[PDB]
Symmetry: C2
Subunit: 495 residues, 2 copies
């Protein structure tokens, strides 16, 4: 009654099990959920349980990754034929790397564009987590928007999962906006980070709602680690860089609208900005993490836009227990709009995203171990990096006790070509790549970012490659040898 404000919809209230029985073999399902936030839970749990009794296969699209071990449960029950666009789940990841589940990682802003222009098969049914349903039958989401507005609109049928664990005071937080349609599309009329251009609920005709399921279950919390000496060193290198830019008249003291990637390094790098002279910041990001709220509390961050909010347990309790402290400083948008090239380039975003590895020519791998093994997906990193005022990628310089260098002669897999990378940072230092040719980037990368264990070997590769010439020097015999050495002998330097 506070939750379902269109009383006639109460006839569609049913069990998670009854709702899941509406999903059958061969269907495409569009579901809410973005980096643990705002996902349907009871329906997919029920779906996975059911599939162990009698099996089926679906194609599943989300906003991004799911928590609550949902991908694990779906994968183990054999439910997933096809999965997109992003997942964080070691069981699913294993299935994908064994060819058992077809995975398509897409630039996070682009899936709904493909759907709306006939390039991608539409969802048959949308399963959307909600804080409330309005008097008009329109859906108020919870802790993320992600792709849910497009999924609800495109799908022939909608399941709404009302989650009592999220307050009805989330209403107002969201700005649901769908671009106008080709061949006569008009501009996305956003010019400031806090513009409201849409509505607070996802507007659909309520006749297409086929089930309302009542649930009460929290989001899985963010698992970001506390900052350590290395992430602190990364933040300090980056701060020094911004200080040089400001003192040079190339940037102001409020920097630029900030986007920070999902995960501990990027979150830790953002926390690092509390110890800095920078004032009156804004964020135009895809995910909002603990660091968003640390920055607001420090008085540094004026406003943050995102698609998804994902917090550690206490911070989550603090924010959503005391929402009115933050509500005027936040907005949640569809991930298409939080990541939109037109908006990213209009605003001049400063994007800070984490690399799995990068090479001496500035190319970045965000996804594949040894060029073959998928981790999670390219996510929004390409939406921001391509169009950003500054595209910054960060990573510790080594992994596995030194056995792996995060800086290599040639990346095993390219997610961002060197054209979309401006600044690279490890605990060792920072490589400013702006205006530099390939041979110039290599000397700066090797000097600044590479671990002492790998510096001489990487310089030897570069110098021997240069002897063979080219705009972008390589030894075709050796370009991928570190990756092969790791795989065959357990250390990149074991020849």
């Amino acid at each position: 009654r506070d939750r379902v404000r269109l009383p006639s919809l109460l006839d569609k209230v049913m069990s998670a099990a009854e709702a899941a029985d509406l999903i059958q073999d061969g269907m495409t399902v569009g579901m809410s959920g973005f980096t643990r936030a705002g996902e349907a839970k009871a329906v997919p749990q029920a779906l996975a349980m059911r599939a162990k009794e009698r099996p089926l296969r679906i194609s599943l699209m989300t906003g991004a990754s799911l928590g609550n071990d949902l991908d694990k449960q779906l994968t183990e029950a054999g439910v997933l034929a096809r999965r997109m666009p992003f997942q964080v789940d070691s069981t699913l990841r294993k299935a994908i790397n064994a060819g058992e589940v077809m995975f398509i990682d897409q630039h996070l802003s682009e899936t709904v564009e493909q759907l709306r222009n006939h390039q991608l098969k539409l969802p048959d049914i949308a399963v959307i987590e909600a804080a409330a349903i309005t008097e008009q039958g329109h859906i108020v989401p919870t802790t993320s928007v992600g792709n849910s507005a497009s999924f609800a609109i495109f799908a022939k049928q909608v399941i709404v999962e009302i989650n009592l664990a999220h307050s009805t005071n989330l209403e107002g937080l969201h700005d649901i906006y769908i671009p106008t349609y080709r061949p006569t599309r008009t501009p996305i009329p956003l010019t400031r980070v806090d513009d409201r251009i849409g509505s607070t609920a996802i507007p659909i005709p309520p006749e297409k709602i086929v089930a309302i399921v009542i649930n009460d279950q929290p989001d899985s919390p963010s698992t970001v680690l506390p900052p350590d000496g290395e992430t602190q060193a990364i933040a300090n290198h980056l701060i020094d860089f911004f200080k040089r830019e400001v003192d040079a008249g190339r940037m102001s003291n409020s920097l630029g609208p900030l986007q920070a990637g999902i995960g501990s390094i990027a979150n830790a790098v953002m926390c690092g900005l509390i110890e800095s002279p920078f004032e009156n910041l804004t964020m135009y990001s895809e995910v909002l993490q603990d660091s968003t709220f640390d920055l607001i509390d420090a008085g540094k961050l004026r406003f943050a836009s995102g698609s998804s909010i994902t917090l550690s347990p206490r911070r989550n309790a603090d924010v959503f227990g005391n929402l009115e402290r933050y509500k005027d400083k936040l907005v949640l948008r569809p991930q298409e709009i939080s990541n939109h090239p037109e908006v990213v380039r209009r605003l001049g975003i400063i994007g800070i995203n984490t690399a799995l590895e990068f090479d001496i020519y500035g190319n970045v791998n965000s996804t594949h171990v040894g060029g073959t093994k998928m981790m999670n997906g390219i996510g929004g990193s390409g939406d921001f990096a391509r169009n950003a005022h500054l595209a910054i990628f960060v990573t510790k310089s080594i992994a596995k006790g030194g056995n792996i260098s995060s800086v290599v002669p040639m990346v095993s897999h390219v997610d961002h070509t060197e054209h979309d990378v401006d600044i690279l940072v490890t605990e060792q230092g920072l490589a400013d790549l702006r205006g530099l040719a390939p041979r110039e980037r290599a000397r700066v990368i090797i000097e600044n970012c590479v671990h002492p264990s790998y510096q001489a070997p990487l310089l030897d590769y570069f110098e021997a490659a240069c002897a063979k010439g080219g705009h972008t020097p390589h030894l075709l015999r050796e370009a991928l040898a570190w990756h092969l050495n790791l795989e065959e002998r357990g250390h990149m330097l074991a020849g």
Copy 2:
């Protein structure tokens, strides 16, 4: 005449005199985009005077230069740096020898970097012009490229009036500069023929420091007539477009078309004359012979570009009778012809040429053997990333079969598989839409690869799958074809 603000006649001087204003250490921003609309006399004089009295400069253009200008400047030892795109075998050699620093940028992005303190400004602009207006504003010639921005950024401007381009070019250009951050508003372009700017480049005439009179045609386009192979590529693509239209997934007017520079893409566009598609529009970077063939055929309504570069007779025919075409054309800054905001808004169908691509859909546009630069990524990334359909084409083999254009892994990624929808060779077409990597590999091997490479590539794929992964590879073998080509002159010679 021509110099419609009489007080500027003051600044008229020889190419040599004007070239002496360019000083050692300077950044120079020049007009010129794939042979069209470049300054000619001033850079040639620069090169001449250099080999008596060195300097060194950093040269920025719209894109590539004709008239062997890059060659002359390279040989005179003038180029310390060069960006963003070049087509010149002498310069390419220097770049590959580390003698000139080359930065290939996405073509829409250079001016964005310049305006937001991310790249050194030009000290001096050198701009070819059809006329200077009553207000001292510059009417460009056969391209806009980066010339509006260069003239505006630079402290000093050298204008080279070229009598070989008619003053009736005025009206062709729509010079638009975006509003600046942090208060930037949208680019108000929603249709292919929108006029959002001015017909001349607005500068205060006081910045004009020299006017040089020249009379010299642009170097003509080197596009070749279509052969059996480019025809077969055009035909695979037309069959695909037909299937889409037939299935209700596309209109009979396709989408606004972008066609890359060079013979294959131009030949594909000519292919559309022999097709059922009607009322086309183009929103492209360069406009080539095929643009005008398509208009003459009554297929193409309107074309927007940044640059027009034609064959010698087509050139004579078009600019000999511009009134035939003027209402169907517009030229825009390359920032705006290629702008991500416009490309995605309009839903461009982009057709660009690959050097090579791989079984996972990645495209190399620039590097031979992963190391040797050809010309530059150009606009292919601006379009491919943001297009409704990103289509890449190439003949399946080269060098009499010694080279496959379809390889296990590209030696150099310019476009990740995220920006590639459709791949086409004379062998067939691979529709990659919604496909996972292993699915892409099967479709590409079946459809695009030459009979003589099909089984080696399938063997690679099948063997790579045994080691597992979302994107299976053999690390020992992934680059072996490129090594084989280099060591032994044939990709299959191990």
